[PDB]
Write a protein that binds this ligand. Structure first.
Ligand SMILES: N/C=N\c1c(C(=O)O)ncn1[C@@H]1O[C@H](COP(=O)(O)O)[C@@H](O)[C@H]1O
Ligand SMILES: N/C=N\c1c(C(=O)O)ncn1[C@@H]1O[C@H](COP(=O)(O)O)[C@@H](O)[C@H]1O
Ligand SMILES: N/C=N\c1c(C(=O)O)ncn1[C@@H]1O[C@H](COP(=O)(O)O)[C@@H](O)[C@H]1O
Ligand SMILES: N/C=N\c1c(C(=O)O)ncn1[C@@H]1O[C@H](COP(=O)(O)O)[C@@H](O)[C@H]1O
Ligand SMILES: [Cl-]
Ligand SMILES: [Cl-]
Ligand SMILES: [Cl-]
Ligand SMILES: [Cl-]
Ligand SMILES: [Cl-]
Ligand SMILES: [Cl-]
Ligand SMILES: [Cl-]
Ligand SMILES: [Cl-]
Ligand SMILES: [Cl-]
Ligand SMILES: [Cl-]
Ligand SMILES: [K+]
Ligand SMILES: [K+]
Ligand SMILES: [K+]
Ligand SMILES: [K+]
Ligand SMILES: [K+]
Lengths: 360, 369, 359, 361
């Protein structure tokens, strides 16, 4: 007989219950840990995708207190220049008071690498990257683990994120190899077809839950990567135990993402594509892709998007009565809902006529 | 691991079973308690929203036996005038025989307040408001509870509704603070985005059930607020234990609601918007507490509903559906309805079967869309 | 806490499992009981609706082995005339499964409401075979008192009573002496009872519960409403119903009352709830429990019935059942998911030809 | 009422990732068609008159799988199709290195028959057919069982597939009659209306699981037939224990399928219809059909489609850590998901602007 080990839930399946609150949303603290050694002033990371994060997006994310991860779909020299552009970026101290800086006052930045890319690691380390994001479609693999061990052997103090994973066994294996954070998410991304092409993945809320429980044993933070559609999803991912959230599609239509605006029938758009899409590909992986190429609406500045996102997170913590993220995770109580309950939660039986800044 | 405490249901998840019946829908009694000390002659309240209830909707809701709550997105002077217009409203006794009146034969009216607005309470009391509705996005908060206590210490005989809540613990805290009713609903409203932007909420049927079980220990009525789409939802909310129902979207397209009619492509509409939408908050009379750098993060949207005619015509269909439900259950009145009610949980397929299906509608029914 | 007594299923929630079969669809037998005393040669009844059944539809339903129930949305004189037109209709080699009474006349049913004893008298005098006591809520004092007064006056008049959806209701009607119960609160295509009133029971679970109770009295169950496809007929009978009442699938036929009309190059006929405004203009300005609509024109009743009964025969062959009783003894269901339902329908292909039994 | 189980199909479940030391390009995808016939990849083109005649069967065999010639033709014509495949086979050796060949280096081919068609069996055997596919709407029937026994009595070494079935009891009865594989699927096909017209069927993932557990007792492979819409479905069907997968709709719009292209509103299509549709019909079964007639987009060559399907299977096995199909089945662990989780799995909150070769909405 077939082994079903779990009925797995994702964001749309659950809601947080309200709790007794003595805190206002404006007063809660949203600092969190990116890795064992790197703190964020707010829990958002822009994805390592060639339509989301290069130096300009990374700079704004760091200025607002989070982080950008420079994607690796470029040569080593180019990715070094991108990292250097962020590090050398820093009126602003009054303007961006929550900026996420290293010990020398420089904006923090991350950069993506792949299996076996030690040459790329050497050059990113030399450029002053704060953290390396070892990215694979399948982080629970010999290639990833061997790469973790080689990097730690050469750079014992380099903070290392590794992913992506979706199981406790994967979290345990990466933590035992010495990673400083695990990135959780197999298939949930907006542009991702891994689950359809390969049949493989875990609904994101259950994946986070399972991996947090294992990673917590090692004191290792979890990055919840992909499938975030609304500010409420950020709140749910953090409440179940993730320490930070990686976001692609919500940031790809911003001014600061790479690529130019274009108009299609009166409305403005920006391209957004999977890094496993055919166009992006022009270790683990004619090509058989695991992502699509598409477009998202133009939404203005990263700052305006992040403001709405973090405001939804602050409202959530106020509803739960939480003074900060760890208290949020201690207090969090979830309810499983039905499709009808989801219909009820969205706007219904009313035709929207003005665009809400945080709801589409 | 993550703590899931229950699987929660809302209206479309459940149906009432029919029972043995000796009563006709036209004979059942639909009087109910608004608060510990205020009865209604029918169980409907119009929402405290600036596209639903000012004096004219409140007058009609009370004349038909229910209640309107004047919204608070206006200065104190204006809200006082709205309350006084309702109080001074009163052939009509033959015309509206179920009118909901105070001890002096005046139509009853409620008015919304926010946290820490004691000046507004003072002036509404002087204007003769029958009940104050202390509304917050999060009623289970120190600010709300401190306001309950300060109002009761100053006005021990003022009936007080406090909300919104969705848990038994919240109902217990408000009841222990001395409220006269609790209002239940976090997120279910037609225009509401709380559950999506914040991730927080409880499906409305389970929230009523859980809050009724707690509030009943204190003899405190529950107002089921938000998410009502059809008259059958009113029946389910009352059957599961709510004493009354607050309705926004279904009343927003009426003659009596504020705002003007407008035509959009051969059809008539009226605007309907959340009180936590941008457009509602941009007005400078919206003092906010829990919801309040620069730019606001809304919890609702701005939209339109079709024009539906008079409040009376809408209420007639709504109460007709409730009477039909009680007839199916065999219930002579609301309390009997709640004692007899038995539910079944249904699937999506069962929901599809319940609506109209496999037929193209060509005439518009007054109670189904 | 709220009393949820069960999680109730309807047709689309379940499938029949195939079983070992030594019978071909063309040789299974589909005779069944309408009442304790009236047999059918096939298990279909046309609904008592003023867009479905008057004499012409009832004649064709009886000729094909089933039954029509003349609706009651007419004065007593006209319903009498409609019953007589069926009774005096009579072809024998053309309709060899015709459902006839002891004198070789086509069987017919007629609907009545609470308290309509004058109507019952006249229908009895016209030779009606079975009276269908119809109410939105059959589990009521008014219905039960009408059952007892009819049986007191006409002890041998076969009587159907409904509609019900619970075992308690089935028990009460059987204890009053009905000859069949009609099950269905809300499932009808044109019905809004469940939306307007919040009341109803998903139809597969309602049949199952009522059949288990009615069987104790030897009383057949009529499964009324919600039938979309021939497979729904198979499920309803397999779960234990003795017969099936159908509205929307027969409203588009030549024989149903009403003119064909054309709307944008296609042909339609009206189909409306009997609790809709249009139809209404005991238990029930009016607050309706149904809508007024249209269904596509589908040709003759005979062509529709042929496809419906072919699906039933196919089902019984899949299960290995020689006849209806055997079908009900062999029947095993699986509950399926939404994905399983999607997989069951036609998927990932654009249909280019209209199938006679699927849309 | 007797509800035996809550039955799931493909979209209800996902495979969990596992620890992996193998790359998708290195896994092995050979499998058993029958007790006696091997495949070099697990795909079979369906026995449908819009999917498989000689040209599609040649390509399926050249790529390592199999084609089953449909039986909607007289015996002479089906013999012609079978020997056209058998006679199809130096630069081809380098071109098709995974070709599925018999003991004499000829491409393998299957052919479909119905109940009581012993004349047709005689002529297919004489034409050198490798395997006969006894196909019925209801394989768990006296007619099918008696036909199995009569074919084995006359041709003891003729490999015989029989179907379709969806229960463990049906798998047991066929295996006890001596079949060499069972074909599983009652109702899941893209064009099929069996479940709607008859009310009968089992969601395909549970049907495979149930039938594999029984057939494994007899060492008999299971062919998962119908309902495949994406390469991940192939992976799930195999991981739950099927030995091979039969595909119709995904191959009907190819160059090699019968029927020519036709343009409809600036796009190219091919016809695809159930073999129980009215058009295809014009033992078990005016006619009452169990299928529809429709069209599918034109997708180019079979080879291109198969390449994407097999790449999805390889990616799946790499995610699970499986070196081959048997190991894939030993390692496989599923989660049940919700419709929300299904929505999350597909592309969401992005409008697709370029068509992926292996994904369509
Ligand atoms: N392999 C599945 N997905 C891909 C693909 C692809 O397959 O082509 N390229 C990126 N990803 C993931 O998607 C996330 C963003 O997700 P989003 O915030 O837009 O929902 C990213 O952070 C990645 O973890
Ligand atoms: N925060 C969620 N909802 C809001 C919003 C908003 O979001 O901005 N403004 C009002 N509400 C609630 O909605 C009910 C009406 O609901 P309805 O009858 O239309 O279903 C009202 O009675 C309020 O309780
Ligand atoms: N009260 C709910 N429904 C009504 C209505 C109405 O609502 O106005 N008038 C008839 N009915 C029922 O519907 C069946 C047909 O169902 P169908 O075969 O079309 O699915 C009939 O046999 C009736 O039992
Ligand atoms: N009886 C249900 N279906 C039929 C029909 C029909 O009834 O008309 N003719 C073929 N089938 C099945 O469909 C599969 C293809 O399925 P697909 O790959 O397109 O999803 C075929 O391999 C058959 O097993
Ligand atoms: Cl730090
Ligand atoms: Cl700058
Ligand atoms: Cl490199
Ligand atoms: Cl800005
Ligand atoms: Cl104020
Ligand atoms: Cl008889
Ligand atoms: Cl669902
Ligand atoms: Cl071999
Ligand atoms: Cl032949
Ligand atoms: Cl090619
Ligand atoms: K809502
Ligand atoms: K209905
Ligand atoms: K006619
Ligand atoms: K199908
Ligand atoms: K996805």
């Amino acid at each position: 007989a077939m082994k079903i080990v779990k009925r797995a839930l994702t964001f749309e399946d659950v809601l947080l219950r309200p709790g007794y609150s003595e805190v206002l949303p404006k007063e809660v603290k949203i600092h969190t840990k990116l890795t064992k050694n790197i703190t964020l002033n707010m829990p958002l990371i822009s994805a390592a995708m060639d339509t989301v994060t290069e130096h300009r997006a990374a700079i704004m994310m760091a200025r607002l207190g989070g982080l950008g991860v420079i994607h690796k779909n470029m040569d080593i020299a180019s990715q070094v220049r991108e990292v250097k552009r962020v590090k050398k970026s820093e009126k602003k101290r009054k303007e961006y008071p929550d900026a996420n800086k290293d010990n020398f006052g420089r904006l923090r930045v991350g950069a993506a690498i792949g299996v076996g890319q030690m040459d790329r690691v050497d050059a990113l380390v030399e450029a002053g990257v704060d953290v390396v994001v070892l990215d694979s479609a399948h982080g629970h693999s010999k290639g990833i683990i061997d790469t973790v061990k080689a990097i730690k052997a050469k750079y014992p103090n380099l903070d290392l994120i590794a992913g992506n994973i979706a199981t406790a066994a994967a979290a345990k294996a990466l933590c035992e190899a010495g990673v400083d954070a695990v990135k959780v998410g197999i298939g949930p991304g907006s542009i991702c077809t891994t689950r359809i092409v390969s049949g493989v993945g875990v609904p994101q809320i259950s994946a986070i839950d399972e991996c947090v429980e294992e990673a917590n044993k090692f004191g290792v933070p979890v990055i919840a990567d992909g499938g975030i559609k609304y500010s409420g999803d950020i709140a749910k991912a953090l409440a179940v135990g993730a320490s930070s959230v990686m976001i692609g599609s919500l940031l790809a239509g911003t001014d600061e993402s790479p690529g130019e605006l274009f108009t299609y029938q009166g409305r403005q758009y920006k391209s957004y594509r999977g890094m496993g899409s055919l166009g992006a590909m022009q270790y683990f992986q004619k090509l058989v892709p695991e992502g699509i190429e598409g477009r998202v609406p133009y939404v203005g500045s990263i700052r305006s998007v992040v403001h709405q996102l973090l405001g939804g997170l602050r409202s959530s913590m106020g509803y739960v009565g939480a003074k900060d993220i760890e208290d949020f995770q201690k207090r969090a109580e979830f309810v499983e809902i039905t499709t009808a309950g989801l219909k009820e939660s969205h706007v219904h039986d009313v035709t929207i006529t003005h665009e809400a800044p945080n709801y589409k």
